[PDB]
């Protein structure tokens, strides 16, 4: 509130013990309990065992004798580790119980002890007169009037001042004393007035606003700079309590104005205290790192006056000179008055100068913690930028920041073995279809799919990508930390796959402790092992779903078909090690024993079978189709007949070859087969390789054959003819508001004092730049930005250019992260599959919006934070009708856009008719405006409405996207509850409340009966790589395996007029 309200204290004045018991003080009997008898530590500073003397002992002195006794030898004995709690306490206590403060106990119930002075008479051996005073005359020390206490001492030995040298905390540091306090025998206020008046002599002295024992004493600095350790510590403490006073909160402080008067300073201290008075801060809440605390503070003033403010630039050049004065502030002032009022003997500081609320400011945010600061650049501030030169970030000298290729996986191990079954649906595969498919399929093989996509599977190897997580499982086990498995446990299989040596057990859970001083060598995987290992999980699981015992039944075996096998096969036995008879085998060229080494066209006479087989071979056959198609059709044939259930990696597959396999098993055994397409969780994010699942069902199927298939389109499209890939760059030369920029991050080093401006102009491209300083002696910030092809679509729209600028002006001195230790930045961020998905829906739509004669505005009907933006040329108006968009109208118009936060979704009262317009209907027909769930039957009616609506208008195209049903059954079987799952007929698409869905057919049939031209358009691989490549985004295991299905099932309808 208003008037500050405190309770002064004079701590020291009231920390000096009563005389009559100033003996038990040394605690002669009991031993000092760490709690409240001293504070202590040993720091990771290799050594640094600090011993803090908490209690009435804080302020002490020691001696030449006191400084002999072990405890001062007890530190230099455990240089390596923290002193032995025992040898410490026990010991310390010896000395503690030694100090015997000379005195003369009394009976008066008001005496005290002055102590400090005394403690000091003891320090030296009672030679320094003041000291030679107490000895024979001990009563001199007791006292009642906090000040008369001393004035007695002086009066008798007659002197102007006594010097009290002043030690430092941490009894373990005989390394001098920064300064020392001088006690001035100046009684009446007038006397002092003049003591310190003349004190504008002698090199460096400084004093506090008020006074302990209320006896003017001053500091004397042994050095010009040591002078700065003190002020800094103290001026900083001031904003510490001052935040509280501004806030209105009883502050029992030793004295209102905590700052301290540079009497004789010297520029540095001149400009340091110069800042002090200004309270340039905002209630931090954090904790500032001491030691460099000075340079931090001294630096801030240089920049404060520096960005200064003209007016207040003077108000500060003023106190820069007139400094022997003190700058309270109305409120403060008013308080000190309550103080003087109480008893006109409080002899507080003479020359001073009330302020007048101080001329406004900048809450110069700060803290010297250790995080680095992640900033989220704002679109439009209010510092209407003229132009300002193109900035030049320096060179990031790795060992500070290294940039790497693919943000390591980081996922819960257990969700790592999840696939998806795209189930066959196509009553018949007529010859008419065969005519078209063979050609389409042969054509793709003739050319080699998209250069852009292929480049992607290889760079993103599900090896490295998903390694450190796996490396971590192994890292702990080697040191005895993984004490709970369950054999059949997925978790058990993974630790095992990861460690070479033989994993063991006992009564489950407890894993036989690593044998003495020995260590297993962390496993060696191929980047095919996690995939094959995972397929096996898929198989045992595919056996009956519901079950968590992944240990190859009793005496049933499987054979591994992957060229270059093991550890894939090897990990399986160690895992299935105890289970009766389980036989495991691995073929494939280049395979080393224990692994037969056959070659693709299986050598005749060699008969093999084994419950479940996994074939991952096949890879490349020069044949150039016809035959390559045939070589593999052939591979699956043996792999097929000989086994009950097995996986075959069919690579391609096209809706043609994969389908051909179906017709073949169709006749080499009358009653067809049951096949599925297992897209397995772990498996090079991209890689459109799909494993057909084949088993002899005993109930026909009356379906087989495929048409779309989430799995097939992945490789069906990706037609190729891409015209080269977009390699992520790393330009480090920020131009002022100019589109030119190519996708990739800005990793650069800009010098501070400029950071504000660079960062400020930088908001025009990316939209979240991370930054840090390494140390307070590194006059350069580090900026990392990654241009985000959406912010650009948005910042650039209708020219202009105003940034939040000055506001970031505030961090400048310090509030700019501060990490010190190599960071890793990946040239490729990670991203929740759901986000990557609509991002993708956009790449199909934007291209389209860029293909329709005249088209005036984009009516985005239900946006939310305006996603649709990056899907409209930097020309059309973008108009969002979103209830919760809440944009200032002005900023709304600055970047030329419009907001109708007026929910509707009903015709007859829906002015869609604005022709030459595009209606983007993404989501919306999902969750009611109230963030709910539009019931499927109802979800249908919304489309019915926009339909009658689009029906009586022209040159408008409505983009409505919905969720067809197939995802639900497919999902119920697949087991990759990553970010989909299927709660009772619905699907919590990430953060979204389940969402009952609808029939693709009913959608088509209703609008079809109506007559609106339509196309159910679903994104493709060309668009996927494009959506992702210019975005620094990558796909990340689980996503790929499930994104194929989700993208495909989550279609779009173009109601075009």
């Amino acid at each position: 509130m208003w008037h500050y309200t405190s309770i002064n204290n004079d701590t020291r004045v009231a920390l000096d013990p009563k005389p009559n018991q100033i003996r038990t003080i040394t605690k002669p009997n009991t031993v000092p309990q760490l709690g409240t008898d001293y504070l202590y530590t040993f720091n990771s500073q290799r050594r640094s065992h600090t011993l803090r003397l908490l209690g009435p002992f804080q302020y002490f002195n020691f001696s030449e004798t006191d400084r002999g006794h072990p405890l001062f030898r007890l530190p230099l004995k455990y240089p390596s580790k923290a002193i032995p709690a025992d040898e410490l306490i026990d010991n310390l206590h010896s000395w503690m119980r030694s100090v015997h403060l000379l005195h003369v106990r009394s009976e008066d119930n008001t005496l005290r002890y002055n102590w400090m002075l005394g403690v000091y008479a003891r320090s030296t051996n009672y030679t320094t007169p003041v000291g030679q005073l107490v000895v024979n005359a001990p009563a001199i020390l007791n006292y009642s009037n906090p000040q008369d206490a001393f004035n007695s001492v002086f009066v008798a030995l007659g002197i102007d001042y006594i010097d009290i040298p002043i030690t430092n905390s941490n009894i373990f540091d005989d390394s001098s004393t920064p300064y020392n306090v001088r006690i001035w025998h100046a009684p009446t206020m007038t006397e002092v007035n003049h003591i310190l008046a003349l004190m504008r002599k002698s090199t460096l002295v400084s004093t506090h606003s008020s006074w302990h024992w209320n006896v003017l004493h001053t500091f004397h600095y042994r050095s010009e700079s040591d002078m700065i350790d003190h002020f800094a510590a103290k001026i900083l403490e001031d904003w510490r309590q001052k935040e509280k006073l501004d806030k209105g909160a009883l502050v029992e402080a030793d004295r209102v104005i905590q700052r301290l008067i540079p009497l004789s300073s010297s520029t540095y201290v001149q400009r340091l205290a110069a800042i002090g008075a200004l309270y340039p801060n905002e209630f931090t809440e954090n904790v500032l790192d001491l030691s460099r605390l000075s340079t931090a503070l001294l630096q801030l003033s240089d920049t404060y006056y520096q960005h200064a403010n003209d007016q207040l630039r003077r108000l500060y050049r003023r106190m820069y000179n007139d400094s022997r004065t003190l700058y309270m502030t109305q409120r403060h002032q008013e308080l000190l008055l309550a103080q003087i009022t109480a008893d006109p003997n409080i002899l507080l500081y003479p020359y001073t100068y009330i302020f007048t609320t101080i001329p406004t400011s900048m809450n110069y945010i700060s803290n010297t913690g250790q995080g680095r600061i992640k900033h989220s650049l704002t679109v439009t501030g209010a510092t209407e930028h003229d132009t300002v030169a193109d900035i030049v970030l320096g060179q990031t000298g790795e060992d500070v920041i290294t940039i790497s290729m693919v943000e390591p996986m980081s996922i819960a191990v257990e969700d790592m073995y999840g696939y998806v079954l795209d189930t066959p649906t196509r009553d018949i595969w007529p010859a008419d279809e065969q005519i078209e498919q063979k050609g389409d399929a042969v054509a793709l093989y003739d050319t080699k799919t998209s250069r852009a996509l292929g480049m992607f599977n290889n760079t993103v190897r599900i090896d490295d990508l998903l390694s450190p997580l796996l490396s971590l499982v192994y890292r702990t086990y080697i040191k005895g930390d993984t004490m709970t498995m369950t054999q059949g446990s997925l978790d058990h299989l993974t630790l095992c796959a990861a460690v070479d040596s033989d994993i063991t057990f006992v009564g489950n859970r407890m894993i036989a402790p690593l044998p003495e001083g020995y260590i297993p060598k962390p496993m060696h995987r191929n980047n095919s092992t996690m995939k094959m290992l995972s397929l096996y999980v898929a198989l045992k699981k595919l056996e009956n779903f519901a079950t968590n015992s992944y240990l190859m039944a009793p005496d049933t075996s499987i054979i591994l078909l992957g060229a270059e096998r093991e550890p894939a096969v090897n990990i399986l036995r160690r895992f299935n090690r105890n289970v009766s008879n389980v036989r495991i085998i691995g073929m494939g060229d280049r395979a080393v024993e224990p692994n037969i080494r056959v070659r693709v066209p299986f050598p005749i006479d060699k008969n093999i079978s084994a419950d479940f087989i996994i074939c991952d071979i096949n890879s490349y056959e020069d044949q150039s189709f016809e035959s390559m198609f045939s070589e593999t059709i052939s591979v699956v044939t043996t792999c097929a007949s000989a086994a009950t259930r097995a996986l075959v990696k069919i690579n391609h597959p096209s809706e043609y070859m994969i389908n051909s396999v179906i017709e073949r098993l169709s006749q080499l055994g009358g009653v067809f087969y049951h096949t599925a397409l297992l897209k397995t969780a772990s498996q090079n994010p991209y890689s459109y390789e799909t494993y057909i699942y084949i088993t002899p069902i005993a109930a026909a199927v009356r379906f087989p054959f495929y048409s779309n298939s989430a799995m097939i389109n992945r490789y069906m499209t990706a037609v190729a003819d891409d015209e080269m890939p977009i390699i992520p760059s790393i330009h480090t030369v920020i131009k002022g508001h100019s589109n030119t920029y190519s996708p990739g991050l800005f990793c650069g080093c800009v010098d501070v004092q400029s950071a504000p401006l660079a960062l400020s102009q930088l908001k025009s491209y990316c939209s979240e730049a991370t930054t840090w300083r390494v140390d307070s002696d590194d006059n350069l910030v580090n900026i990392i930005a990654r241009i985000d092809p959406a912010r650009i679509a948005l910042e650039f729209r209708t020219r202009s250019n105003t940034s939040a600028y000055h506001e970031y002006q505030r961090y400048v001195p310090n509030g700019l992260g501060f990490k010190v230790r190599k960071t890793r930045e990946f040239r490729y961020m990670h991203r929740e599959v759901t986000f990557i998905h609509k991002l993708m829906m956009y790449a199909l739509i934007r291209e389209q919006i860029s293909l329709t004669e005249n088209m005036t505005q984009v009516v985005s009907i239900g946006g939310r934070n305006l996603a649709d933006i990056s899907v409209v040329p930097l020309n059309m108006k973008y108009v969002v009708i979103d209830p919760a968009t809440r944009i200032e109208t002005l900023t709304q118009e600055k970047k030329n856009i419009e907001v109708q936060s007026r929910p509707f979704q009903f015709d007859a009262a829906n002015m869609d008719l604005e022709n030459n317009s595009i209606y983007l209907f993404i989501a919306v027909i999902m969750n009611e405006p109230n963030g709910a769930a539009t019931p499927a039957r109802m979800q249908m009616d919304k489309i019915r409405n926009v339909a009658t609506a689009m029906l009586t208008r022209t040159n408008c195209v409505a983009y409505i996207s919905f969720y067809e049903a197939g995802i639900i059954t497919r999902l119920d079987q697949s087991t990759a509850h990553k970010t989909i799952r299927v709660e009772e007929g619905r699907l919590k698409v990430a953060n979204y409340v389940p969402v009952d869905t609808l029939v693709e057919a009913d959608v088509t049939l209703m609008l079809r009966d109506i007559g609106i031209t339509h196309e159910i358009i679903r994104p493709s691989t060309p668009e996927l790589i494009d959506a992702c490549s210019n975005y620094g985004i990558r796909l990340g295991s689980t996503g790929g395996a499930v994104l194929d299905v989700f993208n495909h099932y989550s279609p779009v309808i173009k109601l075009v007029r």
């Binding site: 030449e64 051996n125 009672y126 030679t127 005989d174 390394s175 090199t203 700079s225 040591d226």
Partner: protein
């Protein structure tokens, strides 16, 4: 050997930073007297804990001075020409006009030992006859006690002389602040717009 390696390894002479931390240099450069006035303290005396070679540093604590520094007082009110914002000198050692032993002779006593203890390791190190380890340790020992007596009046009586000499008329300037590892005199030069100062 080992100690004088980790340690001389860390600069043979430091200078001081702005925030007054100590910035040691890198080379183990020699050290000339003409280099005495100018930011570059000899490094041995830095008296800054150095993880490794610690025996060398410990032996080093022996060198720090005893006496306090009195502030002339008398010469100042008298008006004597001092010129150093606030005159004062450093007296070699407090006049212990109290009782029993000293603090000065008592200090030398532990100095002879810590050192002697050090001489012992080196000697048993270069396997030497006990005949001389002793005769010599015996010798080292004679002045522990032997300088006990001299320091009696040396420190009481010899000291008061400085007590006054610290303040003779012309005999200005501050010679030593008392802190070996960081005291550089005040550089006074006659500046001159005309020629070279």
């Amino acid at each position: 050997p080992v100690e004088y390696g980790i340690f001389v390894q860390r600069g043979a002479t430091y200078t001081i930073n702005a925030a007054g931390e100590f910035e040691f240099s890198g080379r183990n450069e020699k050290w000339d007297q003409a280099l005495y006035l100018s930011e570059h303290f000899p490094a041995l005396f830095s008296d800054v804990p150095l993880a490794g070679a610690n025996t060398i540093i410990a032996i080093m604590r022996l060198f720090t001075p005893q006496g306090f520094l009195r502030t002339d007082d008398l010469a100042i009110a008298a008006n004597f020409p001092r010129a150093s914002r606030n005159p004062q000198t450093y007296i070699p050692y407090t006049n212990q006009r109290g009782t029993v032993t000293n603090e000065f002779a008592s200090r030398f006593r532990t100095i002879v030992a810590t050192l002697a203890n050090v001489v012992n390791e080196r000697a048993v190190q270069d396997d030497m006859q006990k005949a001389t380890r002793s005769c010599t340790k015996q010798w080292l020992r004679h002045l522990e006690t032997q300088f006990d007596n001299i320091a009696v009046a040396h420190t009481d009586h010899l000291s008061v002389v400085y007590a006054t000499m610290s303040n003779f008329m012309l005999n200005f300037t501050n010679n030593f602040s008392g802190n070996h590892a960081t005291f550089k005199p005040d550089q006074y030069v006659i500046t001159s717009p005309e020629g070279s100062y």
